[PDB]
Design a protein around this ligand. Structure first.
Ligand SMILES: O=P(O)(O)OC[C@@H](O)CO
Length: 295
């Protein structure tokens, strides 16, 4: 029963907003605005995407601008409002971005053999006194933001279903804003427990943002699709095809993109469909009562 906002049409039944055929509704911007997902300080990813965005500019013939958005809500609103044209949305926000911002997802990173994904992990710091999930009872649990799968919705569902633990009764929730804030907060002993994306954790460890001896894992979830990449529904069809081509034609070898994302096992972009690959996420959304009320 997934529903797009009534400002979009879904004539072909693939659950994503159709490209308009009224030419007055299409946009052909002279500057394409791109945003990666704020799982971490976007300053970390500015140079990571730089060469990729140069290739995108050459492929599309447009100027390209990196938008260092700081929260999921701001990123969703920017695409809904027409200011953001191409984005990677965090896994947990793809259904909301599809429904309320007209996001058309088409690709996801994968390993060289086509395997993909990340898991939620619940982490503490060594010596915290929190040595398994059950030890969280009566204490605080750090979440990232309410649109996060691994940072809020998946751990809330797992704790309620498998550990008989609900926020406000069995633990007190706190919100850090970002995976990196949660991971840093655990490493610095601000948080005794946090639910985080282990892909982000591994790249932060590789970049020496935190050290291995500062973090202990207490739980690892099932595997989820990673960040979904896509386009605002109302760019001209010709431009959308060129953007997709730019994603698949970019040569990763020797680039800052490969240097970063090889640290969570990625090597390429592969096609996905929202209907298939995000089914597990829509179910976790429904288990948390998510409505997709765009307001
Ligand atoms: O914050 P979540 O929703 O778990 O998304 C992280 C995911 O985008 C990592 O690839």
């Amino acid at each position: 029963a997934f529903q797009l906002d009534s400002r979009y049409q879904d004539n072909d039944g693939d659950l994503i907003a159709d490209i308009p055929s009224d030419e007055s509704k299409l946009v052909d911007p002279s500057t394409l605005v791109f945003a990666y997902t704020p799982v971490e300080d976007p300053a970390v990813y500015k140079e990571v995407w730089s060469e990729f965005l140069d290739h995108l500019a050459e492929t599309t013939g447009k100027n390209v601008q990196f938008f260092p958005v700081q929260s999921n809500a701001a990123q969703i609103e920017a695409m809904r409002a027409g200011r953001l044209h191409i984005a990677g949305f965090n896994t947990g926000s793809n259904p909301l971005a599809v429904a309320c911002a007209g996001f058309r997802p088409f690709t996801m990173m994968a390993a060289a053999d086509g395997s993909f994904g990340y898991e939620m992990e619940i982490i503490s710091y060594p010596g915290s006194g929190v040595n398994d999930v059950e030890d969280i009872r009566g204490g605080e649990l750090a979440f990232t933001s309410q649109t996060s799968n691994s940072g809020f919705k998946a751990p809330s569902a797992i704790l309620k279903a498998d550990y008989n633990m609900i926020a406000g009764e069995d633990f007190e929730p706190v919100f850090s804003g970002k995976h990196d804030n949660s991971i840093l907060g655990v490493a610095n002993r601000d948080y005794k427990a946090a639910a985080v994306a282990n892909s982000v954790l591994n790249r932060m460890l590789s970049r020496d943002v935190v050290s291995e001896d500062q973090i202990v894992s207490l739980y690892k979830s099932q595997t989820f699709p990673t960040t979904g990449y896509g386009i605002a529904h109302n760019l001209t069809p010709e431009l959308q095809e060129k953007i997709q081509d730019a994603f698949f034609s970019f040569n990763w070898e020797g680039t800052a993109l490969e240097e970063e994302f090889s640290k969570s096992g990625e090597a390429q972009f592969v096609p996905i469909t929202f209907k298939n690959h995000w089914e597990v996420i829509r179910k976790i959304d429904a288990a948390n009562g998510v409505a997709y009320n765009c307001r």
